[PDB]
């Protein structure tokens, strides 16, 4: 049998498995990059599909 | 419009066009008239245009489909409007 | 490779091409490790020049 | 290593697929009994499915053990999954495709890079037979190998809603599925089905042959139909409820027609474009296997 | 005793590259100028390598 | 403006084919003195009517 989902039914369950990220995973940190400008503005292609 | 003025003008214009190309000896080839005309139309500013300038040969083709595929791959584009 | 942003519009861009060729001569081994990352750049050079 | 029975792995009670319903663990068949239909003027006609590409995408050098069951089931039925192809680890299945590979596909649905202790796994022959087809999920996204996202759904319709007569004919009216329902029914169904160990169903689908395979298809038609159901709700253009004298009937219009919708909605799981491509590919493969 | 095969290889490389730049079509006038200049630059390189 | 339209549409420059006819570039483009050593000639000076 699969188990009954805890939200399917009205009993309160006080032990639960909460997934949680470890130190290795991180989110929302500002991220660094090497932005690099076009060599000449006249050469830039606005147009093509 | 008088036929003489019509003919003289239209002849003058027709003579005015000069589509970029490179003549070759192979008997299988044809010019991709649409794209070269289009590149003329935008004075070769559009990327397909400057393709047509630096590689006129790209317009010549044997398999009809690859005539465009060569342009889509050379330019990386998903389409041309 | 320390990635290079080169459009290869002007002729002078050939510098980058030589920059790889010399790299392949002076350092064939290291070149062999980073060569695919080189190919990503050379492909722009080819699509634009040939 | 778990031995495969003369029937598939599915004969084992350990792999039973059941959606929760009416306070029990209903088998998919007893849920499909609640399904009911309203044919519209429009018609579905099943075109022949294109043969899947021979090409098996490379299982690129990956140090880790990919959780492939979780990846497929979430790609197909998961509530929040997105961009399923950019990580593209489905390719990894091809690692199992080789004869005498060191990789094993555990019952956890993990593709271990090597055999490992206390981790039971499917017989490598059978997993080779399965991977030989389903590694092509890996090339779901490559432009050369994308599957049709439109016509394939007709088959889904025919396999779900389709009466034995319509299935014989190969054409059925576009139907409008409906069932009496509890709140959030489609979501709970999509999770109960996301939890399934579907790799059993697939490995048996791909390794069995002859009378064993035929018995497998008859035994599991409702399982396949249920996966088809969650998927059909992911593509259905809308899902209304109807009042019906102190009961509420959930109503998906329409079965067998991909609306290509990518906008989220509370009623059901949604396919981002990548999920649409992946599912179309999965349907291509599974239906190609379902007919032999 | 006089010939050095490395330098000779770079002669063929740079000669190839110069005939490459020479064949390269350009639109702007400035590009035409840089195209002529890179050839001289290449020649300088080749002597530097020798 | 109009005579210029016609003229530069014929080509900013020209080369001389082995047959000795002038063949014009059919393209607008500024001259640079680099070209002076090339096979190219400014087209104003062609004296081709």
From Swiss-Prot, chain A:
Inner capsid protein that self-assembles to form an icosahedral capsid with a T=2 symmetry, which consists of 120 copies of VP2, with channels at each of its five-fold vertices. This capsid constitutes the innermost concentric layer of the viral mature particle. This is Inner capsid protein VP1. It is found in: Virion. The lineage of its organism: Viruses, Riboviria, Orthornavirae, Duplornaviricota, Resentoviricetes. Homodecamer; each decamer is made up of two conformers of VP2, called VP2A and VP2B. 12 homodecamers assemble to form an icosahedral capsid. It comes from Bombyx mori cytoplasmic polyhedrosis virus (BmCPV). Belongs to the turreted BTV-fold inner capsid family. It comes from the Viruses. Coiled coil: none annotated.
From Swiss-Prot, chain E:
It is found in: Virion. Inner capsid protein that self-assembles to form an icosahedral capsid with a T=2 symmetry, which consists of 120 copies of VP2, with channels at each of its five-fold vertices. This capsid constitutes the innermost concentric layer of the viral mature particle. Homodecamer; each decamer is made up of two conformers of VP2, called VP2A and VP2B. 12 homodecamers assemble to form an icosahedral capsid. Belongs to the turreted BTV-fold inner capsid family. This is Inner capsid protein VP1. It comes from Bombyx mori cytoplasmic polyhedrosis virus. The chain holds residues 643 to 692 of 1333 of the full protein.
